[PDB]
Structure 1
Amino acid sequence: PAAKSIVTLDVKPWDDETNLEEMVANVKAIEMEGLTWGAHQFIPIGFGIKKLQINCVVEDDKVSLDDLQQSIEEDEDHVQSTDIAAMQKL
């Protein structure tokens, strides 16, 4: 079977008033071969701001994380940045 990695992405908003539900919907709308979206939660990071923390499992040879982060970040109306919170081999 293909080599995989489970990744937890932090997707940060622009402010405490960013529609997080639309933000996560736009991320999960992203479709790539070998990409499986997992669980997610909205985690407070202080001062009322909440970040989207979402899991995804990717096939190493098919899904570029650099590209995935860059595609998520195209949703400028909701996303300010993304960061890899953690990642493990599967």
Structure 2
Amino acid sequence: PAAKSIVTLDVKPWDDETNLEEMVANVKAIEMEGLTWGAHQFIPIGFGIKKLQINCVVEDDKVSLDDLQQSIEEDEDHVQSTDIAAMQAL
């Protein structure tokens, strides 16, 4: 079977006014062979700002995390940056 890894990504908005529901909808709309979106939640990071923490399960041989991050960041209207908060073997 294909080797897989669980990845938890932090997706940050531009301010305390960024529409977070649109932000996560746009992330989850991204399609990649070997990529499966998982659970997500919004976490307060201070001063009213909230970051999106979303898990995904990827097939090691098919999904480039660099490419995935770059794709998410194309949504400049909502996303300021992304970071890998955690990675775990499945």
1:38-85 deviation digits (Å, cap 9, x = unpaired): 000000000000000000000000000000000000000000000000
> What is the root-mean-square deviation in Å for CA atoms of aligned residues?
0.3
Question: Structure 1: how far apart are the matches of 2:88 and 2:36?
Answer: 15
Give the number of equivalent residue pairs: 90
Question: Structure 2: how far apart are the matches of 1:66 and 1:51?
Answer: 19
- Matching residue of 2:11: 11
Question: Structure 1: how far apart are the matches of 2:50 and 2:13?
Answer: 8
Unmatched 5+ stretches in structure 1: none
For the residue of structure 2 that corresponds to 1:79, the secondary structure is: coil
Question: Structure 1: how far apart are the matches of 2:3 and 2:40?
Answer: 23
For the residue of structure 1 that corresponds to 2:50, the secondary structure is: strand
Quote how far apart the aligned CAs of 1:89 are.
Answer: 1.0
Unmatched 5+ stretches in structure 2: none
* Equivalent runs, 1:1-90 vs 2, <5 Å: 1-90=1-90
Question: Structure 2: how far apart are the matches of 1:37 and 1:82?
Answer: 15
1:7-65 deviation digits (Å, cap 9, x = unpaired): 00000000000000000000000001110000000000000000000000000000000
